[PDB]
Structure 1
Amino acid sequence: TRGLHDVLKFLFVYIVFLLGFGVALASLIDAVLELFKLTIGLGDLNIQQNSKYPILFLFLLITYVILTFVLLLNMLIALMG
């Protein structure tokens, strides 16, 4: 460097939101935050990581889409703003 402040606020937002969104459903149903590969990486494959017994996490998947929606808008607003 001797030879990011705007992003610094941004990276905190995803990190804060990922902790919140993850605690909402990812922990509800080591860490499992590997699902934050918004660019690409792994897909969805429903929600089956550990203790995949039928629970109310199905409705949380809709909220997961809601979380995905704002994440797309979050980067769009800042990167293109």
Structure 2
Amino acid sequence: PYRSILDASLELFKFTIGMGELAFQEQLRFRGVVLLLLLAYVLLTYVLLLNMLIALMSETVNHNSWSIWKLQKAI
């Protein structure tokens, strides 16, 4: 399962790309705690992605960019 920090970080990062493995591993002495901890990570990760989406929508809807492009043209 998880043997190193790099491997566990790679397995945990795959939840954002849609390949997060979530299984009830019947090989560890503490398995329900690992399952609950994975669920908590999934919840907090969805909090982070949702917060980023909401904050960036809020920044955009309260909108300039045409003149910034013209400044890039002048440079």
Would the TM-score normalized by the shorter structure come out above 0.5?
no
When the two structures are superposed, what TM-score results if normalisation uses the length of structure 1?
0.40
Q: Per residue, is there more helix in 1 or in 2? A: 2
Answer with 1 or 2: which has the greater Rg: 2
Flag the structure with more relative contact order, 1 or 2, with Cα contacts below 8 A and sequence separation at least 6: 1
